[PDB]
Structure formats: structure tokens, C-alpha cells
Curated annotation (Swiss-Prot):
Keywords attached to this entry: Chromosome, Disease variant, DNA-binding, Nucleus, Telomere
Gene it is expressed from: POT1
One MF term in the entry's GO annotations: telomeric D-loop binding
Any one cellular-component term (Gene Ontology): shelterin complex
Record family assignment: Belongs to the telombin family.
Record localization: Nucleus; Chromosome, Telomere
Protein name, as recorded: Protection of telomeres protein 1
Disease: Tumor predisposition syndrome 3: An autosomal dominant disorder characterized by an increased risk for the development of various types of benign and malignant neoplasms throughout life, with age-dependent penetrance. Affected individuals can develop neoplasms involving epithelial, mesenchymal, and neuronal tissues, as well as lymphoid and myeloid cancers. The disorder is associated with elongated telomeres.
GO BP annotations, alphabetical order: establishment of protein localization to telomere; negative regulation of telomere maintenance via telomerase; positive regulation of DNA strand elongation; positive regulation of telomere maintenance; positive regulation of telomere maintenance via telomerase; positive regulation of telomeric D-loop disassembly; regulation of double-strand break repair via nonhomologous end joining; regulation of telomere maintenance via telomerase
Source organism: Homo sapiens
Purpose: Component of the telomerase ribonucleoprotein (RNP) complex that is essential for the replication of chromosome termini. Is a component of the double-stranded telomeric DNA-binding TRF1 complex which is involved in the regulation of telomere length by cis-inhibition of telomerase. Also acts as a single-stranded telomeric DNA-binding protein and thus may act as a downstream effector of the TRF1 complex and may transduce information about telomere maintenance and/or length to the telomere terminus.
Superkingdom of source: Eukaryota
Principal location listed in the UniProt entry: nucleus
Tissues where this protein is expressed: Ubiquitous.
Oligomer status and interactors: Homodimer or homooligomer. Component of the shelterin complex (telosome) composed of TERF1, TERF2, TINF2, TERF2IP, ACD and POT1. Binds single-stranded telomeric DNA as a monomer. Associated component of the telomerase holoenzyme complex. Found in a complex with TERF1, TINF2 and TNKS1. Interacts with TNKS1. Forms heterodimers with ACD. Identified in a complex with ACD and single-stranded telomeric DNA.
């Protein structure tokens, strides 16, 4: 049987890769081919961030640069910005003999009351990623802020606008337009702060984590390179969660080994049945035919 199966377009007749390569674009094809190689090799440099509106793809920041951005924006001491108005209560920490600091934690309310804090939002100021990542596994969500002129403002959108357990929510830099922090009040779903709600309440275009790979497929009649911009449905594993998980990070590697394990014969590889949409693409200034994999997922049992 095939290692991949189509989730749609099962009515189509399979096209040989040699026939696909001469045709013009766009079209759509059903294929049954083998995976020779793929890119990238390490299945942590494949995860990217794509704006849904402007369609730009860019890299996921490694945790070191977030601490860089944190300390650069995190100021020294606030004055009036503390336990203020009808939004948050905020008692601050201190630090002695650990080189000194005053990290600030701000607890946003729920129609005046403070609810089951597994639905509670935090406005940390002056903290570090590891400290934040430990405050995100128990609390609902924490978003980094810094003391602006007279109002707490989010950091640069190169930093995540929302930390929610094992998911780091990023927005688009030029597509989004940061609004005031006070707009978190006008949030209808006051119990659960859905990431899109706080993004809309602040004017942020949320980027989604995606698997960005490139497959080299060969059915025997020809060799063809196919793209893959999977959210969650190809590996049946959600791409915004692989980077902070071991078993999620353990299965995608196992899946690609089930597809092509380097060491055995090629005719011992399992067949891959996918659906592809070809289309015309420019690179620098040269039109090219690109192939993307759609409506395809892993087979029954690994
Ligand atoms: Zn954008």
C-alpha cells in the first residue's frame, strides 16, 4: 500500500511524472511516486512563519534573540503604571544577589472579577523567556509589554505578542498596526482570550507556523520536485507545537524515515500517493513552474 493517501480528489486518474513535466501550468495531478530526498534535512529548520495577508515567509526566532529584545525594551522602574484602572492588578517582584531586577506581572480582569486563572492574561514587564515560559504552562497566557511614555505597549513584533503554553503567537511586522493596550477591555469573550481576539483587539495579523519542505519525487518515469506548505494536516501534527515538544518532534522524523530511510534499497521504499497543483511562479525574473502538494496525508498506521 501507499505511505501517503489522498484526502480529496480520489476520482482522478494518476498521471506519470514524465507526462507532467512537459505540460504547461497550471494543472492538477494525481501521483504515485517514491521520495528520493527532501529539504531541509533537520526537521526543525523546516518550520517557518507566513503572514496570511501579505504572504511573506520568514524564520522562527531562536530563544536567544527574544531575551535580547526583552532586555532592550524592558525599562528600569515604573511609577504610575502599576495596579491601575479597570484592567489589571499588578504587584511587582524584586531581585537581590541575582544581579537585581524588578520584573512586573499584571493580571488582567474579567468584567471586574479575576476568574479561573486558567483563563487569565498576564502583562509581564522586565522578564525573561524561560521565566515567561514557566508562567505560561500554568497561567492561560502572557504577553510581553514595556513601559512606554504613558501607556504599556507591546515590544517589537519580532517578539511574540502572546505566549500560550506551548504556542508562541507572532504577528506581521508591516501588515499589523499596534493599537493601545487599553483595547483589551473591549473584548467580548472576556472569559477566554482567543489568540485571534487579542490579535484583533490590538490590530495584529497573526502568523501561522507551517512546515515548509521540498520533496524530490520519482515514480520511475521521471523525477519531480514538489513543495509542501503544511499547517497540520500532512503529518497530522500541528506545526505551531512541534518546536516545544519531544514526541511531536519525534514523529515527523519517524514519518520521513518511513518515507525514505537512508540505508536500504530504493525498490524497498514505500510508494507515496499525493495530489499536486502545478502553477507558474517567478523567482528573480524568471518564470518557473512550481509544484505544491495538496490534499495528502500520512496513511493509516505509521
Ligand atoms: Zn504580512
Amino acid at each position: 500500500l501507499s505511505a501517503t493517501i489522498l484526502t480529496d480528489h480520489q476520482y482522478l486518474e494518476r498521471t506519470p511524472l514524465c507526462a507532467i513535466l512537459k505540460q504547461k501550468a497550471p494543472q492538477q495531478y494525481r501521483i504515485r511516486a517514491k521520495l528520493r530526498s527532501y529539504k531541509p534535512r533537520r526537521l526543525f529548520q523546516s518550520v517557518k512563519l507566513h503572514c496570511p495577508k501579505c504572504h511573506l515567509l520568514q524564520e522562527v526566532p531562536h530563544e536567544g534573540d527574544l531575551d535580547i529584545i526583552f532586555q532592550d525594551g524592558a525599562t528600569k522602574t515604573p511609577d504610575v503604571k502599576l495596579q491601575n484602572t479597570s484592567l489589571y492588578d499588578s504587584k511587582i517582584w524584586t531581585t537581590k544577589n541575582q544581579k537585581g531586577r524588578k520584573v512586573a506581572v499584571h493580571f488582567v480582569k474579567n468584567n471586574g472579577i479575576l476568574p479561573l486563572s486558567n483563563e487569565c492574561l498576564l502583562l509581564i514587564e522586565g522578564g525573561t523567556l524561560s521565566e515567561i515560559c514557566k508562567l505560561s504552562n500554568k497561567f492561560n497566557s502572557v504577553i510581553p509589554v514595556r513601559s512606554g511614555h504613558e501607556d504599556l505597549e507591546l515590544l517589537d513584533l519580532s517578539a511574540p505578542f502572546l505566549i500560550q503554553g506551548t504556542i508562541h503567537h507572532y504577528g506581521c511586522k508591516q501588515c499589523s498596526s499596534l493599537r493601545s493596550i487599553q483595547n483589551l477591555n473591549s473584548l467580548v469573550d472576556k472569559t477566554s482570550w482567543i489568540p485571534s481576539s487579542v490579535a484583533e483587539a490590538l490590530g495584529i495579523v497573526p502568523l501561522q507556523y507551517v512546515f515548509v519542505m521540498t520533496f524530490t519525487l520519482d515514480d520511475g518515469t521521471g523525477v519531480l520536485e514538489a513543495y509542501l506548505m503544511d499547517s497540520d494536516k500532512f503529518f497530522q501534527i500541528p506545526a505551531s507545537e512541534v518546536l516545544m515538544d519531544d514526541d511531536l518532534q519525534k514523529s515527523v522524523d519517524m514519518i520521513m524515515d518511513m518515507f525514505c530511510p537512508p540505508g536500504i534499497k530504493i525498490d524497498a521504499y514505500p510508494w507515496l500517493e499525493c495530489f499536486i497543483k502545478s502553477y507558474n511562479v517567478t523567482n528573480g525574473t524568471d518564470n518557473q513552474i512550481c509544484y505544491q502538494i495538496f490534499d495528502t496525508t500520512v496513511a493509516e498506521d505509521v
